[PDB]
Amino acid sequence: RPTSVEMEPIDDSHHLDKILLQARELSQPIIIDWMASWCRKSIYLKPKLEKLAAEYDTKIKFYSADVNKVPQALVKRGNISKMPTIQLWKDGEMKAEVIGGHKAWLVIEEVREMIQKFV
Amino acid sequence: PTSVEMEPIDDSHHLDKILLQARELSQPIIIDWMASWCRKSIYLKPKLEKLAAEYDTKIKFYSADVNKVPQALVKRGNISKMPTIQLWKDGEMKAEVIGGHKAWLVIEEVREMIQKFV
């Protein structure tokens, strides 16, 4: 088992559609970390999430979506109000989400609870 | 006036119109590139509007929210860090103040940038 699993970026809406199909085939949920590379609070939570992704290897794949680099069409699929936003998706839809803004380790413990509720 | 409100830039077409307008007046413009989903970007707005009043009829101030506008507009700013307060003149970016410091300091650096190109 690895100590860290890097999150795979999502490039566009088409890439999001493919990812959701691949997961449905596996009957697994996915995690989407909607982050913003020009906003400091999103670039620092990333390694904490990668540690959490390693604990769930072959059970839940983790992805990132940078709102500062992807088209507004993809950004729109996130229904973003505050940032960062970590969502759990299953069967082609958004099931739950955690909002950042708290200290990174409390955010991670909220994401862990969300995962346990749907894995 | 005490404070002049910054006009949002909706898209690239709007930006092109603004640059042509400013060129006719032989004036620079300020673009405040900010991110509404990032708190460190919105907290500076009243002080920039208070500064926009110090330069009323001399330099127009505009804002651009990277979290709301088309990516085509965002691309024009050639942004690396946020917020970024840029000075534009003769249809191009002339300089910038990366606003990741205390308000009083960011405002003095914007005054310095304006003085250099007005």
Please tell me the distance from the alpha carbon of residue B75 to that of residue B58, in angstroms, as a whole number.
27
The answer to whether the CB of B77 falls within 8 A of the CB of B64 is: yes
Please tell me the distance from the alpha carbon of residue A79 to that of residue A76, in angstroms, as a whole number.
6
The answer to whether the CB of B73 falls within 8 A of the CB of B64 is: yes
Q: What is the DSSP letter of B49?
A: H
Reported resolution, Å: 2.2
Spatial strand order in the sheet of A61-66:
A8-9, A61-66, A30-35, A85-90, A93-99
Query: Which chain B residues have any C-beta within 8 angstroms of a chain A C-beta?
Result: 35, 37-38, 40, 66-67, 70-71, 74, 79-82
Question: In this structure, what token pair is assigned to residue B58?
Answer: 């001399």
Domain boundaries, chain B: 1-118
- CA of B30, closest CA in chain A: separation in Å? 20
Nearest chain B residue (CA) to A41: B38
The answer to whether the CB of A91 falls within 8 A of the CB of A79 is: no
The answer to whether the CB of B95 falls within 8 A of the CB of B86 is: yes
Please tell me the distance from the alpha carbon of residue B67 to that of residue B103, in angstroms, as a whole number.
22
Closest CA to A14 of A73, A95, A69, A58: A73
Q: Which experimental method was this entry solved with?
A: X-ray
Coil, strand or helix at A92: coil
Residues of A in contact with B71 (CB under 8 A): 70-72
